[PDB]
């Protein structure tokens, strides 16, 4: 009784290439296959892209199609579904999948970050699709007042513009101040909107940047020395500043800011560096709660005002978010799988972070039990830990604690997790572990997964291959077999990681046997791998000259751009005084990758309650003619 399976992304998209991997396990001879998609309910958006399966490919194929968007725009407030009904020879299998309206991203770039009234606004609107490629679509833009009333409306097409839409606006003279907003959204999907904020203010450009970085990015509550903050001031163009600097400290809880009257100090800066300390007596007396412990959680904030001895220019710089904490580390379980397998290593990805949020570097972690295990964090703040598991059904209570030296035991950071066992089909004890290296992988270097297996010797001849899939950015990227000769128990599959795998790929896998009374079963696994976040291509700007540095104003210089052939670059030069005055709402690769990762369908970093759970966690939909099919999804976001 051969099976026929369809594996498709859990939520479909409009006007994009969506892949549906087709397998026919234990099938003899060629089988025609036709895939048709119909609207749900009712009945034919597309019925094209049929295929012929051959044993030359080991009976595996993929059918890619792009569903037209039309019936789709009539109703949007309630989720809409489509039915993917495919016929394998004379056997028909169908599955209802959700369809989203999101079709691409709009990254808005404004040249400056603060404008004065009577000055023109120059901004661009990049148009890219889910795969980060230029697309031709129609956009709408509305520029909002501080109160939120549109002031300008426009419609543009990205056709033949290579995904860049330069635009303009001349700010009216009589306008309200404060944050403005620019909201742009694709014309087909008006319920998803992207935005940026630019500030209209009365300003004249400053002359020098003031940096306040405390010695530690926190304040120990029991430290008797007080907060140690260093104020440094350098001119814009690279010279040291002489002046006098006022500073002040306060306690920032929730949204109310209270200042410390006994804290303002004048600390003259010589050679552009000054240091002031907030004695703990001041901190305790300023607040009305003498209990020092009850002050934890609240954040300090440093407001530094610098004036030159000329007295001609004044600049303000503020560093907030200095958390008052009793422990310098915060242990997170965001990346650790929440489900494990009996009798396998259970790789823990602990994420040791500083109290502010930045990743921690070179900190030893340990497990409270079996203290013989100890590790040390990598560059990105993830420490690989391995805990062997007894073959038992009881939930495993894993607690991890930081064991840094020269830190008192009443001062480390602790955390606890509950991990539940993978549940087989009818207690058959047929699992699959998929061991792998997880590090700051760079594109190009290979990876060796370990298709580890565990099953009784009575059924070691039925399994001869391992199917695997690779999610990335929301669509299947690669899908192939992995042959394994019977009698072999570990299989290493070399994976060629190109630059196309940025930033993460959710490798899955499965096999299929018949056992017990002769009922079909499926066993799956998942792995989340984090790749270093950089371009899929490469671009960098440097200077043509190799001599006679510090160009004088009015002098030609040549800047060299080393970009990929055929590409198009867009340039902008901003005075650094603007960033001194307001450094928020910039654009960089980090935010682009954050936005792309925030839209991934998968919603758990690997493993699951069982095979249906594993597939839904990955963001897939595995249905078969026999009946073993994944659970239905009808919500855009997985539960928090």
Ligand X SMILES: *[C@@H]1O[C@H](CO)[C@@H](O)[C@H](O)[C@H]1NC(C)=O
Q: Which two tokens stand for residue 279?
A: 């004695």
Q: Is 94 in the site for other proteins (CB under 8 A)?
A: yes
CB-facing half-sphere around the CA of 181: CA atoms within 13 A: 12
According to CB under 8 A, which one of 1, 42, 149, 160 is a site residue for other proteins?
A: 42
Q: How far apart are CA 100 and CA 240, in angstroms?
A: 55
Site for ligand X in 23-82 (CB under 6 A): 62, 64
Q: Which residue pairs from 173-177 have beta carbons closer than 8 angstroms and sit at least 24 positions apart in sequence?
A: 173/117, 173/118, 174/117, 175/117, 175/145, 175/200, 176/145, 176/146, 176/147, 176/200, 177/146, 177/201, 177/202
Binding-site size for other proteins (CB under 8 A) equals 11
Nearer Cβ to other proteins, position 557 or 634?
A: 634
Collapsed DSSP state (helix, strand, coil) of residue 460: coil
Strands (DSSP E) along 436-518, which ranges?
Answer: 447-454, 467-472, 475-480, 492-495, 504-515
Q: Is 254 in the site for other proteins (CB under 8 A)?
A: no
DSSP 127-164: EEETTS-B---EEEEEEE-SSS-EEEEEEEE-TTTTT-
- For residues 347 and 398, the answer to whether their CB atoms sit within 8 Å is no
Q: Is 96 in the site for other proteins (CB under 8 A)?
A: yes
Nearer Cβ to other proteins, position 255 or 635?
A: 635
Q: Is 429 in the site for ligand X (CB under 6 A)?
A: no
According to CB under 8 A, which one of 116, 176, 374, 632 is a site residue for other proteins?
A: 632
**Longest Cα separation, the chain:** 92
| Residue 301 binding result from ligand X, other proteins, none, given CB thresholds of 5 to 8 Å by partner type | none
Collapsed DSSP state (helix, strand, coil) of residue 542: strand
| Residue 62 binding result from ligand X, other proteins, none, given CB thresholds of 5 to 8 Å by partner type | ligand X
First to last CA, the chain: 41
Q: Which ranges constitute the DSSP H helices of 355-507? A: none
Least distance CB 611 / other proteins (angstroms): 17
- Binding to ligand X by CB under 6 A, coded x per residue (else -) over 479-498, reads x-------------------
| Residue 632 binding result from other proteins, ligand X, none, given CB thresholds of 5 to 8 Å by partner type | other proteins
Considering only the stretches 35-43, 121-129, 511-519, 526-534, report the one whose residues sit in contact with other proteins under the rule CB under 8 A: 35-43
| Residue 64 binding result from ligand X, other proteins, none, given CB thresholds of 5 to 8 Å by partner type | ligand X
Q: Is 79 in the site for other proteins (CB under 8 A)?
A: yes
Q: Is 478 in the site for ligand X (CB under 6 A)?
A: yes
Q: Which ranges constitute the DSSP H helices of 135-235? A: none
Nearer Cβ to ligand X, position 64 or 316?
A: 64
- Binding to ligand X by CB under 6 A, coded x per residue (else -) over 563-602, reads ----------------------------------------
Least distance CB 487 / other proteins (angstroms): 40
Nearer Cβ to other proteins, position 98 or 229?
A: 98
Going by C-beta distance under 8 Å and a sequence separation of 6 or more, which residues neighbour residue 510?
Answer: 432, 466, 467, 522, 523, 524, 525, 611, 622
Least distance CB 498 / other proteins (angstroms): 37
Q: Is 6 in the site for ligand X (CB under 6 A)?
A: no
Nearer Cβ to ligand X, position 14 or 63?
A: 63
Q: Is 634 in the site for other proteins (CB under 8 A)?
A: yes
Nearer Cβ to ligand X, position 130 or 438?
A: 130
Q: Which ranges constitute the DSSP H helices of 347-442? A: none
Q: How far apart are CA 27 and CA 179, in angstroms?
A: 64
The per-residue b/e assignment along 505-519, b for 16 or more CB within 10 angstroms, e otherwise, is bbbbbbbbbebeeee
Least distance CB 494 / other proteins (angstroms): 40
Q: Is 415 in the site for ligand X (CB under 6 A)?
A: no
Q: Is 603 in the site for other proteins (CB under 8 A)?
A: no
Nearer Cβ to ligand X, position 399 or 496?
A: 496
Q: Which two tokens stand for residue 558?
A: 């040549």
Nearer Cβ to other proteins, position 83 or 207?
A: 83
Closest residue to bound ligand X by CB? 62
The two beta strands, 120-129 and 91-99, are unpaired
- For residues 402 and 412, the answer to whether their CB atoms sit within 8 Å is yes
Least distance CB 6 / other proteins (angstroms): 14
- For residues 80 and 636, the answer to whether their CB atoms sit within 8 Å is no
Nearer Cβ to other proteins, position 94 or 144?
A: 94
Least distance CB 78 / other proteins (angstroms): 6
Classify residue 532 by its DSSP letter: P
Q: Is 363 in the site for ligand X (CB under 6 A)?
A: no
Strands (DSSP E) along 531-611, which ranges?
Answer: 541-543, 559-561
Binding-site size for ligand X (CB under 6 A) equals 4
Least distance CB 194 / ligand X (angstroms): 30
Residues forming the site for other proteins (CB under 8 A): 40-42, 78-79, 81, 83, 94, 96, 632, 634
Q: Which spans of this chain sit near ligand X (rule: CB under 6 A)?
A: 62, 64, 478-479
């Amino acid at each position: 009784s051969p099976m026929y399976s369809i594996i498709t992304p859990n939520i479909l998209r409009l006007e994009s290439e969506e892949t549906m991997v087709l397998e026919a396990h234990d099938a003899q001879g060629d089988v025609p296959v036709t895939v048709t998609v119909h609207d749900f309910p009712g009945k034919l958006v597309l019925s094209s892209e049929k295929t012929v399966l051959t044993p030359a490919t080991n009976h595996m194929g993929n059918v890619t199609f792009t569903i037209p968007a039309n019936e789709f725009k009539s109703e949007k407030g309630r989720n809409k579904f489509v039915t993917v009904q495919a016929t394998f020879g004379t056997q028909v299998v169908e599955k209802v999948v959700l369809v989203s309206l999101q079709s691409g991203y709009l990254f808005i770039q404004t040249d400056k970050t603060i404008y004065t009234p009577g000055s023109t606004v120059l901004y661009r609107i990049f148009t890219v699709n889910h795969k980060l490629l230029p697309v031709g679509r129609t956009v709408m833009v509305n520029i909002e007042n501080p109160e939120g009333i549109p002031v300008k409306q426009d419609s543009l097409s990205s056709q033949n513009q290579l995904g860049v839409l330069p635009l303009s606006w001349d700010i009216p003279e009589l306008v309200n101040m404060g944050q403005w907003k620019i909201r742009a959204y694709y014309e087909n999907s008006p319920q998803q909107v992207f935005s940026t904020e630019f500030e209209v203010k009365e300003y004249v450009l400053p002359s020098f940047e003031v940096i306040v970085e405390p010695t530690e990015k926190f304040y120990y509550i029991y430290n008797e020395k007080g907060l140690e903050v260093t104020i440094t001031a350098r001119f814009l163009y690279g010279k040291k500043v002489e002046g006098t600097a006022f500073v002040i400290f306060g306690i920032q809880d929730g949204e109310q800011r209270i200042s410390l009257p006994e804290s303002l100090k004048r600390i003259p800066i010589e050679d552009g560096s000054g240091e002031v300390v907030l004695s703990r007596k001041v901190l305790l007396d300023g607040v009305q709660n003498p209990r020092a412990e009850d002050l934890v959680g609240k954040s300090l904030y440093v407001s530094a005002t610098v004036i030159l001895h000329s007295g001609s220019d004044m600049v303000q710089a503020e560093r907030s978010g200095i958390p008052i904490v009793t422990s310098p580390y915060q242990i997170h379980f965001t990346k650790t799988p929440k489900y494990f397998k009996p009798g396998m290593p259970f790789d823990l990805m602990v994420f040791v972070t500083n109290p502010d949020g930045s990743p921690a570097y070179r900190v030893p972690v340990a497990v409270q039990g079996e203290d013989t295990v100890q590790s040390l964090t990598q560059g990105d703040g993830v420490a690989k830990l391995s805990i062997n598991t007894h073959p038992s059904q009881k939930p495993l209570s894993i607690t991890v604690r930081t064991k840094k030296q020269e830190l008192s035991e009443a001062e480390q950071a602790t955390r606890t997790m509950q991990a539940l066992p993978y549940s087989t089909v009818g207690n058959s004890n047929n699992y699959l572990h998929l061991s792998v290296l997880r590090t700051e992988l760079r594109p190009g270097e290979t990876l060796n997964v370990n298709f580890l297996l565990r099953m009784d010797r009575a059924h070691e001849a039925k399994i001869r291959y391992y199917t695997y899939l690779i999610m990335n950015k929301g669509r299947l990227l690669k899908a192939g077999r992995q042959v394994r000769e019977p009698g072999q128990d570990l299989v290493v599959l070399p994976l060629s990681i190109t630059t196309d795998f940025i930033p993460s790929f959710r490798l899955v896998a499965y096999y299929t046997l018949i056992g017990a009374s002769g009922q079909r079963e499926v066993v799956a696994d998942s792995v989340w791998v984090d790749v270093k976040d950089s371009c899929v291509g490469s671009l960098v700007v440097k200077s043509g000259q190799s001599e006679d540095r510090q160009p004088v104003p009015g002098q030609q210089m040549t800047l060299k751009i080393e970009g990929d052939h055929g590409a198009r670059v867009v340039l902008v030069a901003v005075d650094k005084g603007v960033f001194v005055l307001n450094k928020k709402n910039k654009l960089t690769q980090s935010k682009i990758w954050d936005v792309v990762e925030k839209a991934d369908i998968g919603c758990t970093p690997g493993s699951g309650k069982d095979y249906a759970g594993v597939f839904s966690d990955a963001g897939l939909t595995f249905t078969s003619s026999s009946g073993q099919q994944t659970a239905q999804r009808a919500e855009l976001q997985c539960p928090q």
